[PDB]
Structure 1
Amino acid sequence: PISPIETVPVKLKPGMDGPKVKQWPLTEEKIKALVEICTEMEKEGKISKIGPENPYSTPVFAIKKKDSTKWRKLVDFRELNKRTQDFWEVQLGIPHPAGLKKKKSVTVLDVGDAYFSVPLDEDFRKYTAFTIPSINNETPGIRYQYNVLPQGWKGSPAIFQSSMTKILEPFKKQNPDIVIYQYMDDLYVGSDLEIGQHRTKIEELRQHLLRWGLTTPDKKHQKEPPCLWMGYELHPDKWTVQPIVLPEKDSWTVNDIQKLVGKLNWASQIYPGIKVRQLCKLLRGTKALTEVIPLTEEAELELAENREILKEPVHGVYYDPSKDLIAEIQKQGQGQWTYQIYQEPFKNLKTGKYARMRGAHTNDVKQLTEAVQKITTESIVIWGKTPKFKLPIQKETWETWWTEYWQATWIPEWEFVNTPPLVKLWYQLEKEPIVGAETFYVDGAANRETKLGKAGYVTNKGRQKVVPLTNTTNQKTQLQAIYLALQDSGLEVNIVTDSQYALGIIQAQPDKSESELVNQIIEQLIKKEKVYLAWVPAHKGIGGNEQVDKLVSAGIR
C-alpha cells in the first residue's frame, strides 16, 4: 500500500536544477526484467508513466542482487542526490541494551516494503524521473517517475523515519506504557502484559499500522524468542554479544589479529577483564595485511586469558530506574583500566575498558580521573543519570593530587574500594627548597645544526661536570641535564633549571611517559627522598645559572 500520511516538502539545493543524466543502453534481458517489474510497480501506485514534457532522467538498471535470480531493479541516484537538500540527522545514535528496562514480552515487526509504502512529495516527483530503454536505444524509452520514496534517494531514510514516527504517535498516546523502538524497517515492541494480552496488543498495533499503509507481512506476530540486533542478542530480561569464536591457529595474519581485537573489544562490554594490549602490540608499524605475526609470549598469555573469560556465556541485566547505578573501576595492566556498572552487586548492566592516551606523560591519578569522566558521559547517555563511583584510590590520595594540581576537576560522589593495585603517588616533589641539600644548577645547550649537545651542572658544593651528547635538540639537553643531576645527587637535592619545558613535565608528577629520557628521570625521582625543582630564566646572567652556561655553551653554541 501507500501511506495516507502527509508528504514531507523537499527541495533541490539552491540554484540547482534536477538531474538530466542520459540513460545507458541495457541488455534485452535486463530491459524485460525492468518492464515486468515496473509494471507491477505501476499497478501498485509506486511508479507513474510520464511525458517527454519532463526533462530529467536518472539511469536505471537491473541485476541478480541478494542472489535475486528473480531480478532486482536499481536506480543510480548519484546525480539527484548531489542535487537534493541535506535532510536532518539520517540517524546518529543507537541505544545500548544496558539502558533497556526489563520486559516480560518483546516482538519484532518487519514493515513490508517500507520505502515504497511512503508517498514522495509531488512537487518533487518530477526529478525522480527515469527511463526504461528501447532495445538498442532505437526508439523512445518508457518514462516513469516515483510517487513513493525511492531506494537509494538521499532522503528516504529520514522521511521514512519521520513518517513512521508521526504514524506511531497516536498509538503511543493510547498505549503510554508500551515501548516501541524504530530501527530502519523494523519495530520492536516491548510490554509488561501477560503473554496473551501482549499478543492482542501487537495485533492492535498491526491494525493501526495497516490503517496507515504499512503492512507487517508477518501474520501471528512473527519474530523468534531471541532478538539479534546490531551485534547483540536481546531477550526480554537479559542481553549479550552474539558469537565470538576465536579461531585456533599457529599462524595469525595481521588481518586475523585485527578481526580478533575488534571481536574482543566488542566482547569487553559485557565480559569483565577482557584485555588486548599485548595483542595490539603485535600490530605496531603495520607490516602488510596478508602477513603473519609471531605471537609474543606476552600475547599468548592474553589470548588464553581471553578464551578463559569467554568460556561460559555471561549476560547483562537491564535497568531498574528506581535504584542507583554503581561504577567500579579497576587498574589492570599498564595504562589499562576496566570497569563494571551494576545496580545489585555483580549483576552487570554492562562492562568496559579504558586505555588512555591523554598526553605524552601522565600519571595514575590523572588517568583514573579521565576514565571516571568517560564513564560519567557514558552513563548520562545510557541511563540519563550519573553513577555512584567505587574507586581503587584513597580519598586523601585524590585530594592531595587534585588540590595541588593546576587543572580543575570534579567527579561524581564516590568511595574508596580496596581492589589492588591502588592508585598512589610514587613521588611527591617538594614545595620548598631543602636545607642542606646539594643545589644543582643544571643546564643544557644544543647547536640545532650539528645537533651537538653539552648537558651538565654546577653545584653550591663546587661540584661540576659536563658530559657530551649527540643527536639532541635544545629540549633533550634540558632533560638530560636534570637527569644527570639526579644520578650524581644524594637522596635529597635541589635542582635549578631554566627550562620552562622540562619544569612543565616534571611538575605534573608523571609516573609514565612516551619519552625514554623521562621514564628514567621518574625512576630517579621515586628513589629520592626529597627533590626540589626550581626555575630560573635563560642567559639573564644569574648567580649559579651563569656559570653552568660558561661551560655548557662553550662546546654547545
Structure 2
Amino acid sequence: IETVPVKLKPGMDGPKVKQWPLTEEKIKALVEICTEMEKEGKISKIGPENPYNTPVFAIKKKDSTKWRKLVDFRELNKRTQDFWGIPHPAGLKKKKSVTVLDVGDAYFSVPLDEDFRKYTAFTIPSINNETPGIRYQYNVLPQGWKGSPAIFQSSMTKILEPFKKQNPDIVIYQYMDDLYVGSDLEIGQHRTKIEELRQHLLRWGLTTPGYELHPDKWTVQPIVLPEKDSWTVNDIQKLVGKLNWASQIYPGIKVRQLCKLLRGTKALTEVIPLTEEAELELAENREILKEPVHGVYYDPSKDLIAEIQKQGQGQWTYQIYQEPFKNLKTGKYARMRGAHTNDVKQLTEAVQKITTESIVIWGKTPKFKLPIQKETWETWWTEYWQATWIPEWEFVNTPPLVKLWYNLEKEPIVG
C-alpha cells in the first residue's frame, strides 16, 4: 500500500529521551506484547547505529485486566511536521452525552514511511541491567503519535461516512486514538446507537474497546463569600485579604470601608459591628462576583494552561486559562472512592478528567502546572494512568492566596 512520506519539522532532529525504570511486572508484559508485535511485522529489532529513543511503559485501562502498551511520543510529536488535519465541532460541548472509543488499533494496519521509522525507536529495559535493553522500531503507524490520525484521516472519514450520513444528528470527533461520539438522544438510544457504530467499525478490523460524558454539567461556579451574624477582627482580616487579591480579576472590588473597621489594635476575637457603608461595600462585592469576568474569549493561537491546587481532604481545585486571571473554566474535584490515602492517584485522575474536558471543549490538551514534586510525579504517575494521550506538564509551588480564593467556589445547596 501507499506510504505517505513523513518529515521532521525543519532544523529538528530525532528524540533522544532516556527510558525510565520499570518494574518487573511491566517489563514482562512489554516483552510479551512486543515479541508478538515483532512476529506480526508491526515492529522490528534495531542496532546501536540508531541513536534515537522514546520512552515506553505499560498500563491497564479501567475494568481492563490486561496490559496495554503506551509510548511517550510527546517529544517526537512536538518535532513532527504539522499537517495542513481534523476540524473541531462546537457541537459536542453542547451534546447531552459523549462516549469515548479507542480506535487506536486501526493504525497497525497502515505502513509507515521507511525513512521515518528510525525516529520511533524505543527500549525495553532490563532489571538491574543484567542484560542489554531490547531495541525496537515501528514499521506501521504507531499509537499515540500525532502523525497517525493525520494519515489515517482519509480512511476514517470513509469508514464513518455511512454512519454520519445516516445520523446527521450525532457528532463524531477524533482526537489521537480516541473517538468522541456525542448526541442529545436518550441514554438507551444513545448507548445502543453506539454499538451500531462500534460493530460497523468492528466490521473493518478495528476492535473498538457509568462511562458517558455529559457536557453541560461542567457549568462554571461562582465565588461565594461567607456571611455571619457577628464578624470578628480576624474574620474581616481574612476576608479583606481575599478580596484585595480578587481585585486582580474584578477591579470593581473595593475593601476600603472594611479596612476602616480594622484600624486599631484589637484582639483578633473581638467582635466588630459593621457600618452601613462597609455593609454596602460588601453587598457590592458579592454582586460583582455573581458572574465570570466579562470579555474572556478562547484564542485558538495560544496554549491552554491548567493550574491545580491541593485543597485538602481529597479536594482539588483547578482553573483553565490562557492569560492569568482570565479563566475560561474553573472547578473543584473530589477524590474518587478508593483514593483514600493516595495523593498521586487523585491528582492523576484529576489530570485525566480535566484533560478530557479540554479535548471536548477545545480539542486541545492543556499544559499542566502541578502542585507536586517532579521526583514524586515521575516515580508513580504511570501506575494509575489510563488514557492513551499524555498532556504536557511542569511543577510548581502553589501561592497561598490562589487556593484560599478558589476554596471559596459555590457548591450545591444539597447535591
- Per the normalisation by structure 1, the TM-score is 0.33
2 CA distance for matches of 1:200 and 1:297?
Answer: 61
2:53 match? 57
- In structure 2, relative to structure 1, the CA distance for the partners of 1:305 and 1:208 (3 Å cut) is farther
- Quick check: 1:233–1:239 contact (8 Å CA) kept in 2? no
Q: Which has the higher contact order (CA 8 A, sep 6+)?
A: 2
Deviations 1:461-501 (A, max 9, x none): xxxxxxxxxxxxxxxxxxxxxxxxxxxxxxxxxxxxxxxxx
1:374 match? 353
2 CA distance for matches of 1:156 and 1:115?
Answer: 7
How far has the Cα of 1:69 moved from its partner? 12
How far has the Cα of 1:235 moved from its partner? 5.9
1:147 match? 139
How far has the Cα of 1:129 moved from its partner? 1.6
* Match status 1:350 vs 2:311: no
Residue from 237, 251, 259 that aligns with 2:238: 259
1:14 match? 10
How far has the Cα of 1:206 moved from its partner? 1.3
How far has the Cα of 1:141 moved from its partner? 3.0
Deviates further, 328-337 or 31-40:
328-337
- In structure 2, relative to structure 1, the CA distance for the partners of 1:96 and 1:360 (3 Å cut) is same
- Other structure's SS at 1:354 match: strand
- Other structure's SS at 1:7 match: coil
- Quick check: 2:30–2:58 contact (8 Å CA) kept in 1? yes
- In structure 2, relative to structure 1, the CA distance for the partners of 1:195 and 1:300 (3 Å cut) is same
Structure 2 unaligned runs (5+)?
Answer: none
2 CA distance for matches of 1:408 and 1:94?
Answer: 20
- Quick check: 2:370–2:393 contact (8 Å CA) kept in 1? yes
- In structure 2, relative to structure 1, the CA distance for the partners of 1:211 and 1:325 (3 Å cut) is closer
- Quick check: 2:307–2:369 contact (8 Å CA) kept in 1? yes
- Quick check: 1:101–1:319 contact (8 Å CA) kept in 2? no
2 CA distance for matches of 1:30 and 1:432?
Answer: 41
Deviates further, 8-17 or 278-287:
278-287
1 CA distance for matches of 2:26 and 2:371?
Answer: 67
How far has the Cα of 1:211 moved from its partner? 3.2
- Other structure's SS at 1:99 match: coil
- In structure 2, relative to structure 1, the CA distance for the partners of 1:172 and 1:422 (3 Å cut) is same
- In structure 2, relative to structure 1, the CA distance for the partners of 1:111 and 1:48 (3 Å cut) is same
- In structure 2, relative to structure 1, the CA distance for the partners of 1:327 and 1:132 (3 Å cut) is closer
Deviations 1:199-234 (A, max 9, x none): 5543321122223444442xxxxxxxxxxxxxx998
How far has the Cα of 1:132 moved from its partner? 2.4
Residue from 271, 282, 285 that aligns with 2:264: 285
- Quick check: 2:117–2:138 contact (8 Å CA) kept in 1? yes
Deviations 1:262-288 (A, max 9, x none): 999999999999999999999999999
- Quick check: 1:100–1:318 contact (8 Å CA) kept in 2? no
1 CA distance for matches of 2:361 and 2:399?
Answer: 29
Deviations 1:381-412 (A, max 9, x none): 99999999999999999999999999999999
- In structure 2, relative to structure 1, the CA distance for the partners of 1:76 and 1:335 (3 Å cut) is closer
1 CA distance for matches of 2:73 and 2:376?
Answer: 61
* Match status 1:205 vs 2:197: yes
2 CA distance for matches of 1:14 and 1:257?
Answer: 58
Give RMSD over aligned pairs: 20.6
How far has the Cα of 1:95 moved from its partner? 11
- Quick check: 1:319–1:349 contact (8 Å CA) kept in 2? yes
- In structure 2, relative to structure 1, the CA distance for the partners of 1:129 and 1:171 (3 Å cut) is same
Residue from 397, 402, 426 that aligns with 2:376: 397
How far has the Cα of 1:35 moved from its partner? 2.5
1:136 match? 128
How far has the Cα of 1:334 moved from its partner? 38
Deviations 1:120-142 (A, max 9, x none): 55542232122324556565432
Deviates further, 392-401 or 76-85:
392-401
- In structure 2, relative to structure 1, the CA distance for the partners of 1:182 and 1:339 (3 Å cut) is closer
Deviations 1:519-553 (A, max 9, x none): xxxxxxxxxxxxxxxxxxxxxxxxxxxxxxxxxxx
- Quick check: 2:74–2:390 contact (8 Å CA) kept in 1? no
2 CA distance for matches of 1:132 and 1:395?
Answer: 23
- In structure 2, relative to structure 1, the CA distance for the partners of 1:276 and 1:60 (3 Å cut) is farther
* Match status 1:326 vs 2:305: yes
How far has the Cα of 1:31 moved from its partner? 4.4
- Quick check: 1:241–1:267 contact (8 Å CA) kept in 2? no
- In structure 2, relative to structure 1, the CA distance for the partners of 1:42 and 1:255 (3 Å cut) is farther
Deviations 1:257-312 (A, max 9, x none): 99999999999999999999999999999999999999999999788778799999
- In structure 2, relative to structure 1, the CA distance for the partners of 1:212 and 1:156 (3 Å cut) is same
1 CA distance for matches of 2:52 and 2:401?
Answer: 69
2 CA distance for matches of 1:181 and 1:435?
Answer: 35
1 CA distance for matches of 2:383 and 2:71?
Answer: 64
Deviates further, 252-261 or 232-241:
252-261
- Quick check: 1:241–1:266 contact (8 Å CA) kept in 2? no
- Quick check: 2:240–2:258 contact (8 Å CA) kept in 1? yes
Q: How many residues align?
A: 414
2 CA distance for matches of 1:433 and 1:19?
Answer: 48
Residue from 411, 414, 423 that aligns with 2:393: 414
Deviations 1:503-523 (A, max 9, x none): xxxxxxxxxxxxxxxxxxxxx
Deviates further, 280-289 or 354-363:
354-363
Deviates further, 232-241 or 321-330:
321-330
- In structure 2, relative to structure 1, the CA distance for the partners of 1:271 and 1:50 (3 Å cut) is same
- In structure 2, relative to structure 1, the CA distance for the partners of 1:274 and 1:45 (3 Å cut) is farther
How far has the Cα of 1:118 moved from its partner? 7.2
Residue from 259, 262, 278 that aligns with 1:299: 278
* Match status 1:159 vs 2:155: no
